[PDB]
Amino acid sequence: STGSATTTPIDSLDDAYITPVQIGTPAQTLNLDFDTGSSDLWVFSSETTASEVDGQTIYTPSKSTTAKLLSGATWSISYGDGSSSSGDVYTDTVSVGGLTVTGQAVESAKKVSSSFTEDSTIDGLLGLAFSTLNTVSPTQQKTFFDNAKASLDSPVFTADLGYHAPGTYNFGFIDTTAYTGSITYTAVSTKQGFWEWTSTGYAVGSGTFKSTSIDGIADTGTTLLYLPATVVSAYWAQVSGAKSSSSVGGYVFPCSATLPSFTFGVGSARIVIPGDYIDFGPISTGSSSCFGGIQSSAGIGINIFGDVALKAAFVVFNGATTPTLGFASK
16 A cells, blocks of 8 residues: 655744644544654544644544544653643544554544644644654554554655645655655664664855764654754854854844755765755744754754755655665755
């Protein structure tokens, strides 16, 4: 089997991407944030504290003839921005782009933090990291990909995120028309539960490439690119007026600037992030100070190849017995 679904930016800045997901019988379609940095599929639901729902579409398990309470199971998760959610668990039928999994754990939110409430466009998350990170207790549950894997034509999914435009998540096949040149594959460590890999270096604009190992995660659920302070300083030093602002919480730059590109290495290959991808717009409405899309990972504890980087590539998440990651230009 295979599946193919369009993923769409939630706003004009590509702050996140949503993908329609069918849950239950009859289908209830929710728009979920596909997140290769976590491993829980959770949804706003009829059980979510009413004051914490503001415009989201909810899953109502009592209206699904295939929903079954997973007795005794609870979940609770925190995210990189300090947002969180928790609740109980059902199993139900879940389909993404024509690909169906029966008995998928669907984690129903009883509580969500302010950040989720305030974002009316995201009805929940669909985790695509390794199932070892799944938070369901006392019996850990498998991700949608993990459940689908054996049925897929090939044990892979691909992320093709757009810049200010829709893109695609495919399951079970590699669309050879979706990228240019060849796909370069690179080793993955699953020891921390993430799609963790090592970039071979970077360049700023038309500058020379610096060969240096940068360990980080391929994370569709993170908006920006978080890299070591040395790398980030080198980038922003090429933008007149750019500075790190503690009050704003990162590098900012004059909105009148033309940003240089940023290149990252994948083995001997190179992915070029155009400068425009690094502009996240005014820090507040009407400001002429703009937020940068490359930020320091210092004090995160890990480097994160988020949407800013991933949207410059066609990315293969290869879930073979020994997982790997593939990157192609597009």
